[PDB]
Design an enzyme around this catalytic site. Structure first.
Site, PDB file in Angstrom:
ATOM      1  N   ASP A   1      -9.833   2.612   3.090  1.00 17.01           N
ATOM      2  CA  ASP A   1      -9.778   2.052   4.567  1.00 17.01           C
ATOM      3  C   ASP A   1      -9.913   3.321   5.245  1.00 17.01           C
ATOM      4  OD1 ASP A   1      -8.605  -0.521   4.107  1.00 17.01           O
ATOM      5  OD2 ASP A   1      -6.650   0.253   3.663  1.00 17.01           O
TER       6      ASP A   1
ATOM      7  N   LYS B   1       0.957  -1.138   0.217  1.00 15.00           N
ATOM      8  CA  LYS B   1      -0.110  -0.089  -0.027  1.00 15.00           C
ATOM      9  C   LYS B   1       0.918   1.181  -0.107  1.00 15.00           C
ATOM     10  CE  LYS B   1      -3.983  -2.057   2.760  1.00 15.00           C
ATOM     11  NZ  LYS B   1      -4.929  -1.815   3.821  1.00 15.00           N
TER      12      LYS B   1
END
Ligand SMILES: NC(=O)c1ccc[n+]([C@@H]2O[C@H](COP(=O)([O-])OP(=O)(O)OC[C@H]3O[C@@H](n4cnc5c(N)ncnc54)[C@H](O)[C@@H]3O)[C@@H](O)[C@H]2O)c1
Ligand SMILES: NC(=O)c1ccc[n+]([C@@H]2O[C@H](COP(=O)([O-])OP(=O)(O)OC[C@H]3O[C@@H](n4cnc5c(N)ncnc54)[C@H](O)[C@@H]3O)[C@@H](O)[C@H]2O)c1
Lengths: 282, 282
Positions: B109, B72
């Site tokens: 997220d 990420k």
């Protein structure tokens, strides 16, 4: 009910009917199906080598690819395994990708055209046939013809190198002197004496209007095939129909190459009528 | 009604519920949807660099990717554009791929967890919150908390380097000293004095049974969140419920990160209830 991921590597793919056929048939069998153009003239894949694109498909979970011009020969050495027929022709249009990225090449142009002859010309006389055009599609068509009971196939092309190279490949593949290259000049008299003739040239297409030979050489007793599928009724097939000849239009191969590929890709038995209806709807 | 092609680049993806959520919601919206794991521990993509896999997705017509551990952070510099929030956190979990292979990074997220707090803790008191765990998920959770009205967040991690690095990143992102790293040792007394606490550690998972702190420090007036979603009722959340505390279970973020990503990928408005039902059915 696992989803199915397929694509087509080639050039100039916007109008292909192949994606739609496969996406519709997967869905009709209860399997969400994506079939992507992978067009090396287009906006995503330009500039990329064939090996990069094939590798990409492996890594990102494709279950299969079709391959079209100018890649059907180039792809062979990249694959892990290749069917007998595709090997002997030297051309692959269908790549099955298993769960590890292992690849097997096949040729559903050959099986497709053969199936079209069974479906559309079950009673045709096959002793002597003429094929005009020895390009890519012509190579698959000739193979199909002489493995499906054509005794002597005479193939003409404006480029003599192509017709003889074809003859050599096919005769090796089938183990006999099935195919003979003949001159394009004076092809009408050769056709007149034969049982059937197949056009494997661009003639008849909107941008190539007309016919590859003078239709006056046809008789009512001939059968006539055409690889061109737009328009379905080419000037050649209209002339043949006018005389009462049996005809094999170009949609049969086009549909059956996709039927046969879907079977290979998925293990499912495709519904020919639904894939035919998708094709004709576009 | 164009088909949708998505995937997830990460490690150890067999049990992810994300593919199923997206494939079901695309189909419910009348759009055949394939969502592939792209698992660099698995049988197709092992040994391949992140840039090779991202490039592959561009070439072969993907509309988007999710990105999970350990990629990420690494993915950011590979992208053409990155959202403000993802830039400031330094982490991307969602990559939108337009029709040319141009890429934009986002972080669902963060948006996911924030939406879960609105949906599941609308009345929570946010003056003082403690978060235990400063890994990857913890970084997104902390950001969400302090952009959603938490005044002072105290973050503890067994590794002090992680908690302070988190605090520095988030405080820069939001422009104030919202987050303070505190010791894990004696965290119970810090929790006792706060309004709420969030577990962002593996504790509670089957393979990590127990809790990250002594639940005796909780009171009925606290709210308690957990990032763990298997089991949904962790030992921590059971203790909190026993006292009458409001709780935020880990399925809310998990579902909403996918809701928000599907919206980004497709331009469609996802049905939250259907994606929640897919998640819980697995
Ligand atoms: N039905 C299908 O599934 C399908 C699929 C792909 C292409 N096609 C059709 O097949 C046609 C041929 O495709 P290809 O890829 O093999 O093309 P190609 O251009 O590679 O080959 C066509 C051959 O025809 C020859 N030719 C042209 N005019 C001639 C003439 N008057 N006399 C003798 N030979 C002549 C050329 O010299 C060439 O070698 C296309 O134009 C298209 O309409 C059909
Ligand atoms: N709900 C969701 O959407 C979702 C998604 C991914 C992961 N998760 C869950 O989040 C958990 C954390 O994931 P991550 O990727 O950030 O993991 P990570 O291992 O990178 O980080 C967890 C952190 O917890 C710290 N920690 C462990 N025990 C501690 C303790 N007793 N006290 C204080 N700190 C402690 C570790 O030192 C580490 O820095 C996973 O185990 C998983 O259960 C949830």
């Amino acid at each position: 009910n696992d989803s199915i991921l397929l694509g087509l590597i080639g050039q100039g793919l916007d109008l292909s009917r192949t994606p739609a056929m496969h996406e519709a048939e997967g869905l009709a069998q209860g399997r969400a199906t994506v079939y992507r153009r992978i067009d090396t003239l287009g906006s995503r894949a330009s500039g990329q080598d064939l090996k990069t694109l094939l590798d990409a498909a492996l890594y990102l979970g494709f279950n299969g690819l079709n391959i079209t011009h100018p890649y059907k020969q180039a792809v062979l050495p990249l694959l892990d395994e290749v069917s007998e027929q595709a090997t002997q022709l030297g051309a692959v249009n269908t790549v099955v990708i298993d769960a590890t990225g292992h690849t097997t090449g096949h040729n559903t142009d050959v099986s497709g055209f053969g199936r079209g002859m069974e479906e559309g010309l079950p009673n045709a006389k096959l002793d002597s046939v003429v094929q005009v055009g020895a390009g890519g599609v012509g190579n698959a068509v000739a193979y199909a013809l002489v493995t499906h009971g054509v005794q002597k196939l005479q193939v003409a092309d404006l480029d003599t190198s192509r017709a003889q190279a074809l003859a050599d490949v096919i005769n090796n593949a089938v183990g006999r002197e099935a195919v003979v290259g003949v001159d394009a000049r004076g092809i009408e008299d050769v056709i007149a004496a034969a049982d059937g003739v197949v056009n494997a040239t661009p003639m008849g297409m909107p941008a190539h209007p007309g016919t590859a030979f003078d239709v006056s050489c046809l008789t009512k007793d001939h059968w006539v095939g055409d690889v061109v599928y737009m328009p379905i009724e080419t000037e050649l097939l209209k002339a043949a129909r006018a005389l009462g000849c049996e005809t094999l239009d170009g949609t049969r191969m086009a549909i059956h190459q996709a039927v046969d590929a879907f079977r290979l890709f998925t293990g499912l038995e495709p519904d020919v009528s639904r894939m035919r209806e998708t094709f004709l709807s576009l």
